[PDB]
Amino acid sequence: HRSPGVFFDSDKGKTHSSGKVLYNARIIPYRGSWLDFEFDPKDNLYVRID
DNA sequence: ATTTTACTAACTGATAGCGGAACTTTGGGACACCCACAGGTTACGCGAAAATGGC
Prior knowledge:
By secondary structure, this protein is mostly beta strands. It is built from no helices and 4 strands. Strand 2 and strand 3 (35-39) form a beta hairpin. The protein binds one DNA strand through residues 2, 7, 9, 26, 28, 33-34, 36, 50.
């Protein structure tokens, strides 16, 4: 399985019309909710809980 | 004279009905005081079409 912790990933420039490689960080625990920090194609940082 | 058969009456079993008591079944009640919930979740991805938002 995927180890608990924090993982930094990217969409590899395959979501938005241009390249604009979008970066995200996911905190995944053993038990509990998930935390997501993502960049939008406007260079703003957004948070998602679960 | 004897043997086979048709007729009849009695026995017996099935069955519908009833009695009645036990058994299952339904509805009501309980007066210290108690006063807003979960409840797991998700590492999908893609294309369309439908609903929102921007000025």
